[PDB]
Design a protein around this ligand. Structure first.
Ligand SMILES: CCCCCCCCCCCCCCCCCC(=O)OC[C@H](COP(=O)([O-])OCC(O)COP(=O)([O-])OC[C@@H](COC(=O)CCCCCCCCCCCCCCCCC)OC(=O)CCCCCCCCCCCCCCCCC)OC(=O)CCCCCCCCCCCCCCCCC
Ligand SMILES: CCCCCCCCCCCCCCCCCC(=O)OC[C@H](COP(=O)([O-])OCC(O)COP(=O)([O-])OC[C@@H](COC(=O)CCCCCCCCCCCCCCCCC)OC(=O)CCCCCCCCCCCCCCCCC)OC(=O)CCCCCCCCCCCCCCCCC
Ligand SMILES: CCCCCCCCCCCCCCCCC[C@@H](O)O[C@H](CO[C@H](O)CCCCCCCCCCCCCCC)COP(=O)(O)OCC[N+](C)(C)C
Ligand SMILES: CCCCCCCCCCCCCCCCC[C@@H](O)O[C@H](CO[C@H](O)CCCCCCCCCCCCCCC)COP(=O)(O)OCC[N+](C)(C)C
Ligand SMILES: CCCCCCCCCCCCCCCCC[C@@H](O)O[C@H](CO[C@H](O)CCCCCCCCCCCCCCC)COP(=O)(O)OCC[N+](C)(C)C
Ligand SMILES: CCCCCCCC/C=C\CCCCCCCC(=O)OC[C@H](COP(=O)(O)OCCN)OC(=O)CCCCCCC/C=C\CCCCCCCC
Ligand SMILES: CCCCCCCC/C=C\CCCCCCCC(=O)OC[C@H](COP(=O)(O)OCCN)OC(=O)CCCCCCC/C=C\CCCCCCCC
Ligand SMILES: CCCCCCCC/C=C\CCCCCCCC(=O)OC[C@H](COP(=O)(O)OCCN)OC(=O)CCCCCCC/C=C\CCCCCCCC
Ligand SMILES: CCCCCCCC/C=C\CCCCCCCC(=O)O[C@H](COC(=O)CCCCCCC/C=C/CCCCCCCC)COP(=O)(O)OCCN
Lengths: 57, 56, 104, 175, 64, 53, 459, 303, 121
């Protein structure tokens, strides 16, 4: 109940591998989900240019 | 029958030839680490009347 | 030769999937009872009575006479804990509380 | 036997009693040991004599290797690797020799305990004191270096111990 | 086959983070470690104090 | 291979170390020196730092 | 050192030029000859080491591992001969090529005078193992298993590389000899703490540590028999070798930093031994037993005493041989039954008596019966830990009891009782399998005659 | 010279020859049990001689013949102790085993694996002889575990019977509980007295502390089936009657007691451990007799 | 070590003239043998991709592969050795020309240096 199922099969699996898989999957979904509209990409580029001009100097 | 079994069993010489070549290469690498030969404070030794190097 | 539908699944919530799970494990819907739907990964598995394999009938012609099991019948979750080589729950001539108190 | 030194492994003179038969009944031990001698000891001795003459027909010798003394870790510069290598090798050899010395003293102690029989507590106090002193010295030398021990760690332990000793002596004198 | 699969490969997909499960996992997976750490740390602290004061009597202690 | 490993020459210097110890203890018992010294390195060649505290 | 490396390299052209029906014979014969050649490395000295050149050196810690690595290849070929019968000649040659590449990588890893070369080969061993697991595995989980076996390893090993190069920027060298001779104490600092963690966790993930052991049951259960043997016998010992080699620069920070890992290993040996008690899978049981034994070896290395190092060396060698034998026995059962479940094939002593004798000997040597080298390593580690702290004896006694319990449980469940009635395809054991078990077990009982050959450089 | 050592080692040596011949042709015939019985009888009549020498003179001896590994200042060697206990117990055990095998030739006449039965009996005898004559703790541990494994194999002789396997695993479990204390004692003696040899242990322990003697007491309680760990001895009656008569009645079970006899110079210098041993023995004997007076199985009563 | 701006450097010279004062690599250099082995592997892969007998399809093609690899490897090894020699020469000259930045450390024996001892317990 504890050594085999609770810790080995569930929690030790939940902490290192499953959390990593979940976080990476969520980040991949967030980053790769772009509708291909150059308007959004250009607005993001303008925001980045302004941020760098206001931050790195 | 010679010249017929050779074409089938010639692969068996590969490993022993590799072993001999490795021994030769080990001796060749040995030859390049003689900077302290007969110069150790523990084995400073006067050469024999017919001895050139303490070890090869 | 086992198909995907023959494997244990998630906890049953509706009577229809409860009957389907009972059919899967070769038991009556009335006799079927899953483990409580808690965090533990029991899922849809029958909760057979916690009786040991020692107290099963030794005169019945089982398919596995030493294990006292039949071929297609459902297997207890803790079968390897009750194998007649380990802890058994057979009734005793004296009550458990009485034995504990007397020995202590 | 000449195969080992009597001084390194001392033994008492081994006084033994004389047989004093108080009865005319003949004991089984003497007859049994005589028949054992005849049936076992003689053939073994003849085979050994044959083997010994065969060995004498072919005689050859081997020599105990001797090692020169080399400057130890105290006469080594901070980063001069050659002298540190030589000192480390010398220190390891000395460590092995000290291990063998402790082994010899322990063998003496065990032989005493078995030999003196029921009076080992009193007749083996000398060996007990010898082993106590040797063990104290060995423990002071090498007790807590641990794995990855080196001549430098041994020297550091000695320096720490002698600093403590010097401070204690100074305080006692200045008490 | 159903028994082995349910015992081995059907646990995590049916797992659900629950106060019972979280508490039991935390206890059974952390409590023993900290308990044994406290025990061993206390024992070694007492040993170190005794050896520092010199009243430990380590005669004949040569192999470690 | 087992016969080869069994008859390997003594490169670990076990018999050498034993004989060295026998000769050393024979010497030291004869002159009465107190067996093995506590100091691995002689103190006169060590230069301690003076505290002056 | 090249007298061993070059024949191993020549094993590849010979394998690829061999006739379609003579690959196994040639590979086995020449691997056995290479092992005979490698036996010469056992002649070590009480002095520094056997420094062959600037690149490769030997030691009495490296030599037993090298001998075991060379000896394992013929057994792997003999066990793989069975289930690769229906395979094309090209794919059989590719399998043998993977095995030969693994052996060459291990041989070059164990000598490795320098730490970056050691890291390069220590990671180079990953690729052939991953290919073997994910290509010639039977079930659909093998791919998943491979992913685990990869990423865990890299998760520990990429930081190590960083630490390594950092050290070479400060010390100026990564040579083992210069590192040992010029070692300086580590100040108790946060930077030094994280350097310690980076140096240590890469090897602790490969033992594996109790918290990081999840990949091992997957990789062992899913890999083919040769993969299981090479994983349990040699690949687990790479972490122990790395820790033994790298703890020299970590002192005195090891005293404080070792406590979490000591607690994890001392409790995880109990946890995994208890896990072995309730297991429906033979391979999973053997894998968890391996985890327990390597937890004990971790404790030995962390305590860092001469007796600890000797016992750890002996235990790594003994566990390698014993675990390989156990996996071979389970594979022989599986090739007949095709299920890999302990409870299904029962009463096998009545049908295969000699195989039952092999099972009994393997279980006895896994149970650490004296005077086996398993017991020698176990006892040396226990004595060193008792000197470390007298309360460890409770945990070690518990571990010994549970180990005996689950070993005899595995023996009794499969060999004793009444045979399964419906299972009728159990043929008599072949000469190949019996010879495999004999070649596994005879070296153990020969090594118990000369224990000093496997007791490491601190003997 | 002094045939004591030669005779004492020859008895144990010739106890092993049938095990060597177990792979020969005689093992495949029906003359093997008689071969083993005759070997045991000859060993007994050969070991009767050192007993006579000791009775005449009081001769005692230590034979450290083969040198095993040496770990720094610790030297391990194959060493035999031939004191009064060994030279007295060896003939008695050999005589009992001879009677047991003669009875076995009639009791197990219908057993298909009777040669293996006699091989097992001889292996147990060899392990017990190793246990009794051991001069250091490692050899004593070797015999300790050998007799336990042999009892495990002989209790589950009828491996098709579930209860026999259960009893064998029960015996292994309780004996491992004892082995915990055995290993504790070994580790303490190595760490503090720097030896597993008996002479150094006796010499360096004028006032033995509590822990090693408590470990020895735990091991003895485990192997002799005292009250804490008693049930395995009655449960071991699942084996064949010769096994119960030889191992679990008169030879193997005394081993733990024999262990405490080996360390009596150290037991006499501690009063708490002596009191614990006395109390354990008293409660064990009372409880076991109380259980016995109401049993119906004859073998259980004798156990 | 940015030696692109090193004084007196001809722009597109692969091997300068001063590089001729260095010993050329031996024709049995292990790196040259590795380059030839790379060429042989390229030949084998070329035979495999085109679906030809891998070992014995084109001997002239494999010979050309090995020869070209050996040629380029020899010249590359020459350039590498020259570049490392330049680095060492510059480092030694800079050390010689800046004595105040690289003082001679006083030789101190281990007998007079106090190192802290940490017991292993
Ligand atoms: C005791 C002294 C013996 C010395 C004589 C020389 C013996 C040499 C044997 C070497 C090892 C055998 C190889 C292992 C594979 C088995 C071979 C086989 O296939 O059998 C077929 C063969 C033919 O039978 P079959 O009818 O065709 O097949 C029927 C079925 O197979 C049915 O099979 P089965 O039911 O008949 O089972 C076979 C049998 C045998 O099969 C086995 O299980 C063998 C495994 C034994 C140990 C298990 C691992 C534990 C670790 C111990 C390591 C010590 C090794 C020492 C050096 C070894 C050198 C190689 O199983 C047993 O009886 C259980 C044995 C348990 C012994 C526990 C005691 C351990 C300590 C003993 C003392 C050792 C050191 C003493 C030091 C102090 C005194 C000087 O059977 C035999 O030949 C039996 C072998 C003889 C019994 C050996 C038992 C003890 C020997 C231990 C090692 C030698 C000690 C060295 C000197 C000691 C003095
Ligand atoms: C560590 C350093 C030391 C070792 C160095 C390692 C690298 C060295 C070699 C590098 C590559 C060069 C050659 C590879 C070309 C590929 C050709 C091929 O496939 O082989 C077929 C060919 C035989 O087949 P065939 O009858 O000609 O026609 C069949 C078709 O070719 C094809 O038949 P098929 O299409 O019907 O069969 C299909 C099969 C065919 O697919 C393949 O076999 C592909 C070939 C492997 C990929 C090559 C990758 C490039 C190199 C990377 C090496 C990585 C090493 C690092 C470690 C990580 C491992 C990945 O594919 C599959 O089965 C699909 C699944 C495959 C399983 C997963 C794939 C894993 C592949 C990884 C292999 C890496 C090691 C390769 C070793 C050599 C293999 C030939 O093999 C050979 O005969 C050539 C082998 C070498 C010739 C030796 C001659 C020298 C002996 C005489 C002189 C003595 C020397 C000493 C002098 C002094 C003595 C007196
Ligand atoms: C079938 C039933 C039995 C029939 C057979 C009856 C005969 C029984 C006899 C067999 C065992 C009984 C014990 C008898 C022991 C005698 C042999 C022993 O004394 O020799 C040992 C020798 O054995 C070897 O040391 C151990 C064997 C080598 C182990 C290497 C394994 C082989 C390599 C294969 C690959 C390895 C794979 C594992 C990787 C590590 C100890 O030697 P040692 O006291 O020291 O000194 C030897 C003499 N000197 C002084 C000149 C040096
Ligand atoms: C998942 C399965 C296991 C994986 C591996 C686990 C093993 C790794 C655990 C690392 C060991 C501990 C790390 C640091 C130990 C230092 C000692 C410290 O803990 O004790 C006190 C430190 O106090 C506090 O602990 C400060 C740190 C608090 C923040 C750390 C987070 C605590 C829990 C996080 C654990 C999560 C680990 C996994 C991360 C993914 C001492 O006080 P102080 O004298 O002042 O500091 C001494 C050190 N100095 C001198 C360098 C300054
Ligand atoms: C990825 C594997 C490497 C493959 C490389 C391509 C192989 C085919 C190339 C065929 C010959 C190319 C050599 C060009 C002939 C003359 C070059 C010469 O005129 O240029 C000099 C320069 O020589 C070339 O740059 C060197 C080319 C050598 C490339 C090989 C290095 C590979 C790295 C290690 C991997 C091992 C690969 C081995 C197998 C090929 C002068 O440069 P300079 O005007 O002053 O400064 C510009 C460069 N700066 C700004 C960076 C300083
Ligand atoms: C800074 C960022 C650090 C990034 C660290 C990357 C760790 C390497 C693992 C990356 C995996 C991410 C992808 C992922 O898991 O997706 C979920 C994925 C979905 O499966 P798919 O086959 O892709 O598609 C299914 C639908 N048909 O789930 C899985 O299969 C995962 C199975 C293998 C898991 C691998 C185990 C990795 C965890 C071990 C420890 C490594 C963590 C690294 C950091 C540790 C912290 C120090
Ligand atoms: C600390 C001890 C912890 C106990 C470990 C528990 C291990 C559990 C797994 C074991 C496997 C299960 C098993 O063996 O089955 C139970 C099996 C079957 O029972 P039977 O009565 O034989 O039934 C046969 C008739 N049908 O019985 C057993 O063998 C289990 C035995 C467990 C004993 C545990 C109690 C021990 C307590 C010891 C305390 C006394 C210490 C000594 C004091 C003296 C010191 C001087
Ligand atoms: C048998 C057929 C041959 C009959 C003719 C030979 C008769 C005897 C003559 C042989 C010559 C004597 C001999 O063998 O040499 C001694 C030689 C030891 O050499 P040493 O140098 O003294 O010590 C080793 C370290 N250097 O003795 C032997 O090896 C042979 C006898 C050894 C005892 C028998 C072994 C029994 C136990 C086997 C091992 C069991 C495991 C270990 C037990 C652990 C106990 C702590
Ligand atoms: C099995 C998966 C586990 C993954 C392994 C995790 C453990 C490894 C530690 C995390 C990465 C650290 C790498 C450090 C590389 C060594 C270099 C070094 O130590 O030098 C230090 C560098 O120290 C650092 O920079 C450490 C910063 C760490 C940043 C990344 C943190 C990653 C997450 C850490 C949390 C987890 C901690 C415990 C992990 C245990 C494993 C679960 C000094 O830097 P300087 O500035 O040059 O010195 C001058 C000033 N004194």
């Amino acid at each position: 109940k504890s050594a085999s199922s609770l810790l080995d099969l569930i929690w030790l699996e939940t902490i290192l591998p499953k959390t990593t898989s979940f976080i990476q999957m969520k980040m991949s979904i967030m980053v790769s989900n772009q509708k291909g509209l150059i308007k959004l990409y250009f607005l993001s580029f303008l925001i980045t240019i302004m941020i760098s001009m206001t931050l790195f100097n | 029958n010679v010249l017929q079994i050779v074409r089938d069993h010639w692969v068996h010489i590969l490993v022993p030839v590799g072993f001999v070549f490795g021994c030769y290469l080990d001796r060749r690498s040995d030859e390049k680490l003689t900077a302290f030969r007969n110069k150790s404070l523990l084995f400073k030794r006067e050469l024999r009347p017919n001895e050139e190097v303490t070890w090869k | 030769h086992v198909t995907k539908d023959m494997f244990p699944g998630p906890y049953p919530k509706t009577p229809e999937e409860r009957a389907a799970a009972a059919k899967k494990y070769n038991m009556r819907v009335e006799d079927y009872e899953p483990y409580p739907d808690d965090g533990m990964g029991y899922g849809d598995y029958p909760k057979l009575p916690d009786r040991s394999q020692q107290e099963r009938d030794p005169w019945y012609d089982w398919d596995h006479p030493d294990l006292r099991l039949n071929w297609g019948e459902p297997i207890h979750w803790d079968l390897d804990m009750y194998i007649r080589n380990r802890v058994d729950t057979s009734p005793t001539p004296v009550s458990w509380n009485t034995m504990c108190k007397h020995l202590f | 036997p000449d195969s080992w030194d009597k001084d390194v492994y001392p033994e008492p003179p081994r006084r033994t009693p004389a047989p004093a038969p108080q009865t005319s009944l003949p004991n089984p031990v003497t007859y049994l040991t005589k028949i054992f001698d005849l049936l076992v000891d003689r053939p073994v001795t003849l085979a050994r004599e044959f083997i010994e003459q065969q060995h004498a027909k072919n005689r050859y010798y081997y020599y105990h290797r001797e090692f020169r003394r080399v400057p130890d870790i105290t006469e080594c510069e901070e980063k001069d690797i050659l002298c540190m290598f030589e000192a480390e090798m010398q220190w390891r050899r000395d460590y092995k020799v000290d291990q063998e010395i402790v082994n010899i003293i322990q063998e003496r102690l065990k032989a005493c305990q078995q030999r003196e029989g029921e009076s080992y507590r009193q007749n083996c106090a000398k060996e007990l004191e010898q082993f106590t002193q040797v063990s104290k010295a060995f423990q002071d030398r090498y007790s807590d270096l641990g794995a990855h021990y080196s001549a430098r760690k041994c020297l550091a332990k000695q320096k720490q111990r002698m600093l403590a000793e010097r401070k204690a002596a100074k305080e006692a004198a200045a008490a | 086959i159903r028994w082995t699969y349910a015992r081995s490969a059907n646990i995590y997909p049916n797992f659900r983070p629950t106060p019972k499960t979280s508490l039991l996992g935390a206890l059974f997976g952390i409590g023993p470690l900290f308990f044994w750490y406290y025990v061993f740390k206390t024992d070694r602290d007492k040993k170190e104090k005794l050896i520092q004061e010199g009243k430990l009597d380590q005669t004949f202690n040569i192999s470690y | 291979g087992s016969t080869f490993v069994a008859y390997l020459p003594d490169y670990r210097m076990q018999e050498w170390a034993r004989r060295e110890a026998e000769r050393l203890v024979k010497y030291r018992e004869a002159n009465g020196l107190p067996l093995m010294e506590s100091n691995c390195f002689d103190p006169n060649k060590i230069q301690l730092p003076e505290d002056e505290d | 050192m090249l007298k061993i490396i070059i024949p191993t390299t020549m094993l590849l052209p010979m394998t690829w030029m061999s006739k379609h029906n003579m690959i196994w014979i040639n590979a086995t014969v020449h691997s056995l000859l290479i092992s005979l050649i490698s036996l010469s490395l056992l002649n070590q000295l009480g002095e520094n080491s056997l420094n062959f050149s600037l690149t490769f050196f030997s030691d009495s810690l490296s030599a037993p591992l090298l001998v075991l690595t060379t000896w394992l290849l013929p057994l792997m070929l003999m066990a793989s001969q069975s289930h690769l019968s229906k395979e094309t000649t090209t794919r059989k040659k590719l399998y043998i090529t993977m095995l030969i590449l693994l052996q060459l990588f291990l041989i070059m890893t164990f000598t490795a005078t320098e730490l970056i070369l050691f890291y390069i080969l220590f990671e180079a061993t990953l690729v052939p193992t991953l290919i073997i697991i994910t290509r010639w595995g039977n079930q659909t989980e093998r791919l998943n298993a491979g992913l685990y076996f990869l990423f865990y390893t890299l998760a520990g090993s990429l930081p190590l590389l960083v630490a390594l190069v950092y050290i070479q920027n400060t010390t100026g060298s990564l040579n083992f000899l210069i590192i040992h001779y010029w070692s300086h104490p580590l100040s108790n600092s946060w930077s030094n703490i994280f350097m310690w963690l980076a140096c240590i966790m890469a090897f602790m993930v490969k033992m594996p540590l109790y918290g990081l052991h999840l990949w091992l049951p997957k990789a062992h259960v899913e890999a083919p028999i040769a993969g299981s043997m090479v994983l349990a016998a040699v690949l687990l010992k790479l972490g122990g070798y790395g820790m033994m080699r790298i703890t020299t620069i970590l002192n005195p920070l090891t005293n404080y930093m070792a406590y979490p890992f000591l607690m994890l290993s001392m409790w995880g040996m109990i946890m995994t031994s208890s896990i072995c008690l309730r297991q429906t899978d033979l391979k999973s049981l053997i894998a968890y037993s391996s985890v327990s034994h390597m937890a004990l070896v971790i404790v030995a290395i962390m305590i860092q005493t001469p007796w600890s190092f000797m016992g750890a060396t002996a235990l790594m060698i003994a566990h390698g041989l014993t675990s390989s034998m156990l996996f071979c026995l389970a594979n022989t059962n599986y090739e007949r039954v095709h299920s890999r479940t302990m409870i299904l094939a029962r009463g096998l002593q009545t049908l295969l008596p000699l195989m039952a004798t092999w099972w009994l000997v393997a279980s006895l040597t896994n149970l650490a019966l004296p005077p086996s080298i398993n017991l020698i390593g176990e006892l040396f580690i226990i004595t060193a830990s008792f000197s470390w702290s007298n309360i460890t004896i409770i945990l070690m006694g518990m571990n010994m009891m549970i180990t005996a319990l689950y070993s005899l449980y595995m023996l009794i469940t499969t060999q004793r009782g009444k045979y399964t009635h419906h299972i009728n395809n159990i043929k008599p054991s072949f000469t190949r399998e019996n010879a495999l078990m004999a070649l596994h077990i005879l070296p153990l009982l020969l090594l118990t005659l000369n224990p000093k050959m496997i007791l490491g450089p601190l003997y | 010279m002094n045939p004591f050592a030669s005779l004492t080692l020859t008895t144990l040596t010739i106890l092993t020859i049938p095990i060597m011949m177990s792979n020969s042709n005689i093992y495949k015939t029906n003359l093997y049990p008689n071969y083993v019985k005759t070997t045991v009888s000859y060993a007994f009549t050969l070991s009767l001689v050192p007993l006579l020498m000791f009775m005449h003179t009081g001769q005692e001896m230590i034979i450290s013949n083969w040198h095993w590994m040496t770990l720094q200042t610790v030297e391990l060697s194959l060493s035999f102790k031939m004191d009064y206990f060994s030279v007295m117990f060896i003939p008695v055990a050999l005589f009992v085993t001879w009677s047991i095998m003669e009875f076995s030739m009639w009791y197990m006449h219908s057993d298909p694996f009777i040669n293996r039965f006699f091989k097992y009996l001889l292996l147990f005898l060899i392990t017990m002889m190793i246990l009794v004559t051991a001069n250091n703790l490692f050899q004593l541990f070797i015999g300790w575990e050998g007799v336990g494994i042999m009892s495990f194999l002989l209790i589950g002789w009828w491996h098709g019977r579930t209860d026999a396997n259960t009893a064998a695993l029960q015996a292994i479990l309780y004996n491992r509980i004892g082995d915990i204390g055995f290993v504790l004692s070994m580790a303490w003696f190595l760490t503090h007295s720097n030896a597993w040899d008996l002479q150094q242990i006796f010499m360096l322990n004028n006032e033995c502390p509590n822990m090693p003697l408590i470990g020895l007491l735990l091991a003895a309680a485990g192997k002799s089936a005292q009250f804490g760990l008693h049930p395995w001895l009655p449960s071991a009656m699942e084996g064949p009657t010769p096994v119960s008569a030889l191992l679990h009645s008169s030879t193997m079970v005394v081993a733990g007691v024999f262990l405490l006899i080996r360390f009596y110079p150290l037991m006499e210098t501690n009063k708490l451990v002596q009191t614990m041993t006395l109390c354990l023995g008293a409660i064990t004997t009372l409880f076991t007799a109380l259980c016995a007076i109401t049993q119906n199985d004859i073998k259980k009563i004798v156990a | 070590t940015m030696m692109s701006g090193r004084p007196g450097r001809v722009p597109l010279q692969f091997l300068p003239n001063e590089a001729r004062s260095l010993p050329p690599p031996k024709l049995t250099d292990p790196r040259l043998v590795y380059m030839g082995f790379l060429g042989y592997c390229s030949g084998l892969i070329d035979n495999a991709i085109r679906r030809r007998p891998v070992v014995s399809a084109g001997l002239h093609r494999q010979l050309l592969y090995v020869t070209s690899f050996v040629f380029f490897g020899y010249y590359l090894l020459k350039r590498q050795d020259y570049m490392y020699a330049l680095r060492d020469h510059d480092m030694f000259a800079y050390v010689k020309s800046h004595p105040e930045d690289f003082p001679e450390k006083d030789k101190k024996t281990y007998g007079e240096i106090l190192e802290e001892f940490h017991p292993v317990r």
